[model samples]
Target: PRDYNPISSTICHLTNESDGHTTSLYGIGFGPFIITNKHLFRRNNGTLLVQSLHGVFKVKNTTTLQQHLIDGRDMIIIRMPKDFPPFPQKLKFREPQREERICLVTTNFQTKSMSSMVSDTSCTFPSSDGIFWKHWIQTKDGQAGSPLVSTRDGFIVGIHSASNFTNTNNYFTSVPKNFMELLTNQEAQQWVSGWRLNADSVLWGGHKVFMSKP
Candidate 1:
């Protein structure tokens, strides 16, 4: 399988023009629901512009926290305008192994305000939990909501939540439990089916890590 492009397929860029804010968007299923930091979508009501390989998409608010607080772990889920085209399957959820080697995939802009580009970097997670995981990955601004993916099999472990100003340590919102709870709603499940991709097309990567979506 092609290594590099497959990794990029899991990530996209989210832009809120009214607030002039842009951040990373990570794909979950084929409704091609997106996960991002809650703060990015906290501005009352506005359209979210998604920059993807397929094309630009307009996303509406599905669910987000009432407060813009990271209270241990914070995340907001949104649905794509329509079903996604051919893309990789959603990953199965799994806790990070002790001292597990991993990589962070995000969308970055070369200039202060311009085109979006893929950004990948080597990193490692220190611990895991049902809610969040800690790591020492070196990251910069605009990386929030990036997928914390395993370098071994490419399965996503968590969503990049926050990092210190000095880039010393980082935190990711664990996927399985958090996302599963969010999907408990019947409406959410129905919406996911609208855009999720076929799992049969996804080949086994022969990697130990796994995760879930939709």
Candidate 2:
């Protein structure tokens, strides 16, 4: 079984400024850029709020890099505070394979805590929509933008976008290498090279790894 405790740390709670609607923000790459569905911020043009164990962070900018997913203008890249944790613990990613069971990580707003839905299906597959994967996990309305992570490798494979209530299947936008390349720049490229994934290392399993030195 995958440890839910460590995985929880990689996710943060987000709230929109206008309606105060909440969603989940997951850590990606070696820095503060996070992936989410563009629909979450579609109506709310004000500053977004993100709350993690480290602290509350305000997201002021988002780059609309891709608009070719199943959902309308679905993918968005968010810029978090520079002080936000670069990488979260054992969390990592690899190319998703067919028939792989993964975890859909999101927030339980009722209890105000992180929760996950284990794959109800034996396996998941890539969608015909080009940049998404299909799964049988039930994603609630506010659960959009949650992270879908591989159970085997503890890495993120996609971001939850929309779900079918009748079919109870959800679609997530995959985070391909090329997309990561689109978000990368001077600082991000540097960190990606230096921060090697060491399975033996326990950096931010349950805690935030501040970029600042001790």
Candidate 3:
């Protein structure tokens, strides 16, 4: 399992060329496309030059938020150019089990980023949409854009989105849900067609959405 550890290689930092702010960009064997926060994508001006493991190049093809905005899909898929370097191993995804202790591996160039495993969450009620899961990691200091990896096998389960360290509340948008939803776009399908969504946990993490807030 260590051989396929996807964190170190699959994560990258995207510094907003406009304001010089930074955000995390993640990849999960989704061909030449990578995932980043939708809000960050806008801050970078949608199209800009990005240097990957391969070399420096301009990246323009990114998904739209018109449909995803209605839900908790805070993630955006950016189609990396052909020159983007490919990883030696493929990335994979699955639903996390109930009370699953996962590690949030965040990569950043400016803000301090490190790997840490905190407790997982049960279905957060009207507080959030079911497509995302809650966690108890410290994220008030810019650890929001990270991958929620299985502490046991290192498979990427989801990506971190938001947090309130004072209250010990954090969240990750499920990778599987985001992937399938983004696939509906013909552009995303054309750019990335070789992603793997496998080995989901049978336990229903967030099967119901409460109308009333938790």
> Each candidate's TM vs. the true structure?
0.61, 0.63, 0.59
List where candidate 2 sits over 4 angstroms from the true fold. 18-30, 59-73, 83-90, 109-121, 165-167, 178-214
Per-residue lDDT value at 71 in model 2: 30
Name the TM-score of candidate 3. Answer: 0.59
Model 3, 33: alpha-carbon shift in Å? 1.2
Supply the global lDDT for candidate 1: 0.50
TM-score of 2: 0.63
Query: What range of 10 consecutive residues in model 1 has the weakest lDDT sum?
Result: 205-214
| Tens-digit lDDT string for candidate 1 (119-186) | 34465544433455667666565666777777666666677765544557666776554445454344
Task: Give the candidate number with the greatest TM-score.
Answer: 2
What is each predicted model's overall lDDT from 0 to 1?
0.50, 0.53, 0.49
Show where candidate 3 strays beyond 4 Å: 1-5, 18-30, 44-71, 108-128, 165-167, 178-214
Residue pairs with backbone overlap in model 3: none
Question: Best lDDT goes to which candidate?
Answer: 2
